[PDB]
Amino acid sequence: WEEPRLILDQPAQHDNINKRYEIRFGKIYLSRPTMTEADGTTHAMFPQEARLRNLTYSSPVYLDMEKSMFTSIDGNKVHIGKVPIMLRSKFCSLRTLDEVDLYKMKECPYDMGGYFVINGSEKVLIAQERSAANIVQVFKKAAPSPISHVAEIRSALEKGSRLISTMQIKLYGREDKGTGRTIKATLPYVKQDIPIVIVFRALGVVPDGEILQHICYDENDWQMLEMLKPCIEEGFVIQDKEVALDFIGRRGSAALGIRREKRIQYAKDILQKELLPHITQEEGFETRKTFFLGYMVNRLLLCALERKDQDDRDHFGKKRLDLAGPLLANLFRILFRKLTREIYRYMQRCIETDRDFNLNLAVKSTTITSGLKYSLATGNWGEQKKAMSSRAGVSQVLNRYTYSSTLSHLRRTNTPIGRDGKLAKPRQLHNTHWGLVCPAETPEGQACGLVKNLSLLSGISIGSPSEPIINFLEEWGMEPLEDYDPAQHTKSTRIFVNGVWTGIHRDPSML
Amino acid sequence: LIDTAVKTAETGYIQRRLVKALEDIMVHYDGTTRNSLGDIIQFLYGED
Amino acid sequence: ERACMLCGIVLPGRVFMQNGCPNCDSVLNLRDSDQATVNECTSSSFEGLVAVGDNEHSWVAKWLRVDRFQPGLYAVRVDGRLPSDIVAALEQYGVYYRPRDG
Amino acid sequence: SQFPYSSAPLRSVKEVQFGLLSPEEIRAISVVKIEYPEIMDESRQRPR
Amino acid sequence: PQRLLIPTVDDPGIWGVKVRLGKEKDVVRQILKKKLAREGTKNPLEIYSAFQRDSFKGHVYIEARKAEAINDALKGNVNVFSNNSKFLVGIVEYKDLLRPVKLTRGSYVRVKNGKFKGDLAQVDEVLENGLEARLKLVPRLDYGKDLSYTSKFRPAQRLFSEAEARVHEIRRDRDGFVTYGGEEYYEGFLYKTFRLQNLIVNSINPTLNELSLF
Amino acid sequence: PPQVRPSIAMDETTQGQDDLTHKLSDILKANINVQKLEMDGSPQHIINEVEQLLQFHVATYMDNDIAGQPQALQKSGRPVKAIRARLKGKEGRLRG
Amino acid sequence: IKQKLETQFTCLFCNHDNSVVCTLDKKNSIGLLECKKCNLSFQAPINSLSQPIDIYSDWIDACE
Amino acid sequence: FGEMERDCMIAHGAAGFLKERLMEASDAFRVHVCGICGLMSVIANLKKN
Amino acid sequence: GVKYTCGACAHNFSLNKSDPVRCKECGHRVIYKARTKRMIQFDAR
Amino acid sequence: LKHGTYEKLDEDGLIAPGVRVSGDDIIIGKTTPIPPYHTKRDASTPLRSTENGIVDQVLLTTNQEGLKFVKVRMRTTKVPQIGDKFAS
RNA sequence: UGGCCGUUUUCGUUGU
Ligand SMILES: [Zn+2]
Ligand SMILES: [Zn+2]
């Protein structure tokens, strides 16, 4: 559903007509794994059969296309590919058959599965780890740098939970060196930084009073006022939305000469979208974005005031574990984009002939199947032609030298921190690990401290719909930001969800 | 554990560098310590 | 696509079969002739893909002698040679021929 | 002892002289000119 | 006379732009279709023609009178590298970008097509149509030893000997002219209709075996 | 000679060509092409581009780790083996 | 110190690329541009946050 | 016969052993050189003398 | 001359390297060879 | 041809289960047609020279692509002796 | 009747 439509057009003039080909993606169909011999004979396949014959426990998939034609003078169940299935999962033969049949089917009742098979090699997925998304962290940079504090945030769309953009606020200036302590923001798809005040103005709050009240919620904290004052001092050449936006668009990393005609809208696009995408993308909701910027800068300054500690980059609560689910999701998305572009190109060099395509010579299901097969075959978690620069070692031959070894191998973790530069913060243990990872287990040598193991009562969140949650919050008197001001709600409790500010409330304890 | 794992490689590197540096110094008959070219580093090895 | 020997216009063989040459069907008789005549007047081989849309003043159009020939795909070079019958018929009607193969 | 009989006298290396190659030197030493990208004559053995 | 048609300053300018490799023909036809569709519209495409020469692979030229005209002639094309890599052309070079640019009977030629690729021959007879040329080859036949081919399992070559084919495996037409399975064998030499695309007549470097035989 | 660039028999009868031999052949191709520009239309720009390509081949043939610019690959996408690699690193001829 | 920048900007009028120099004069808050073929120049006040891209864009807007 | 082994052998000051361990128990080879250019290019045919 | 044994129906038969590799009786596609006839020894140690 | 022995194969080229194998012994004799008599080359699969035991269970089925596709599970028992490893 | 030929490159896991 991410890209549910393919669209073409034809302003054929030879009599001017606009012929539109619009292909729509519909429902997905999944099948139980099935063998098809070279003889054309087909039969439901079983794991043991696979191991014996170097097969692949895979479920061919059928997707519902929808071919449509729109001429203006002014599909079916399509076989797309084969997804390997993890044994004992809901979509494997063995979920049924109870124990007695397993003996018939030559699979030990003890083996808990949980792994895939490809060419007869029992490959396993080592769950990876990543820093939590939609969260604000503060890092002091090294002394030999005009940057003193950094407020990095990696935003990812809640739906899917996929990386979109990464943003940083850098507190420039040194101690009586660098003159005033200017704050210059960094934005996506640009080659140069921008002052904070400029982005405040270009997003709707042009006047200084609104800007300072949004950033600051402690008026008596004169230090904040005087430390952001240099930004105010330099933030006077810009006084309206428009020159601010053009300033942004004048450094849009785009072509040269997009003029004030289209450059302003380029800036408005790069501001509405590509910026804090996890919050929103529609117009008329810049209030949320401005409030979030204000919170970010307030926290950054507070860290710059040493009134609170910088978050520990090894803190586990800020760490998230990627299981097989999302990993396969991302790989499938890459293969899906490739398939979509394949179909679009075939439409290009088959529609001009105006020959009705069969949706069968076009869709090359070989792409998905070969891609997934090779990816899990070598673990090079990406397309073959980009073997280099590809996260490696995420799929490995399962170890069955003993039952306990196999049990451990299926609860392993990993860290994508590499080894170029030893350091010790990533490798060492931490207090937060209490009751979530084994304080006793880890390999030896280069990986010592990286590869972890979940405790004996660990559990991984799969995600729940937040819409009922917000409904409850909204059901319970939460006060939107549009009724928020530092003066009034100086003791009311801000409310956050999934890392995104989502309201204001005064009496939280009952809530 | 981490400390040992880190220290071993660094010690190996330092030992390699040193060995490469002094690898050519030898003691001739005259009692003077010269590298390949003939530079004299100690006129009497170790001063004894 | 087969390029007409005289004007150089190249269009799908179905176009010549159903409509002849856009410029030379009046003198070459491609639309209402046998397949041999069309094939010899339009060989599958051509070179110099020149996309001409404006020719009344285009320098290249004058160069190739396609200023009068309707703008389109024209063949700078064509291999082979026409039979004797087509050349003789064209010379009879006032059309001295010049292959563009160069 | 491993090598067969050879008439040339046997001695050791004393000096190594570095320095580039004069193109006439290369021509004086090369025994062939390379002109054919096709390594294998016609896939009929006997490379070109 | 083409000599009095030489270009001038008042003739339209030309810019040579790079596009996606191999899809130069696609970009050329896209340009033609845009010009034909935008011919006379309120914003007509200000070009005279677009052309590509095979030797200049990846290079596309559009005849316009302003840089933005070339930009919009190449705009809206995915088969073009997004860069506006265009370079002007000298007056003498304008005609050099459109210059178009040895098959005789008894000429030693080699084959490249099908099973008999890489075999030198003599061109025998050229059809009137001018697309197929007869060749004189040394057959590579198996005399019904394994009949119950490609360019990698093929046995060696040898002139047709009628006696061997008679003894092992044949409609004699004339003295030395044998029709054997749709193949013409004159005086022991293989004769077949070879498409001119399948043969090489220029730049043939005779080999040791050819000196021994030819 | 081949002594320095022997070929790898992937599976006995199947023989694959040394990457150095491929780079040598590609340099020969670029050279031959550079020969056949002056005898036909050579609108300056083409000659310069082809010259740069030949220089690029002969360079990556002798160092595939030239700073600042992308490396050369095989049909497999893996970076080429220039002689500088053959001599440097732990596995160079010296330390190897 | 005046910097003479031979930026890759193209000139609108003389149909030549890299024939445009967007000189910087911050001393008096003045913009200067030098062309190489038609030698045209553009003048405009510049502030601390203005850059050759900004001068070029303002020049384009003025020309149109 | 890694670096460190070579260094230990040097330290024990055993020359000839190190020589042969790196010569006869490894790629022992013979060549010819021209005394003028000093290079190995001398084309020789031993049996042909 | 070269006996076999099915993995699904466990009925014996043979083949002469020309028949397709399938069970004659139940059609199954997994087979095993059977024990040789020369004598097998163990020292029980 | 290899330097090892072939006699333990069957008449069709596979070794029967229950036969003892030794180092440098051929267990699977495969032949490749030679691109042009005497036009075949050994493509055997000799046992790892550092192993011994008895062949136990020979499998012979088609691959995904319909060619013969064999598997030989040789076995032996490891007696602890001088030079093993153990751990509490 | 001597004579006699078994890949590389990656990545992984481990071992001291
Ligand atoms: Zn015509
Ligand atoms: Zn100018």
Ligand SMILES: [Zn+2]
């Ligand atoms: Zn010499």
Ligand SMILES: [Zn+2]
């Ligand atoms: Zn059976």
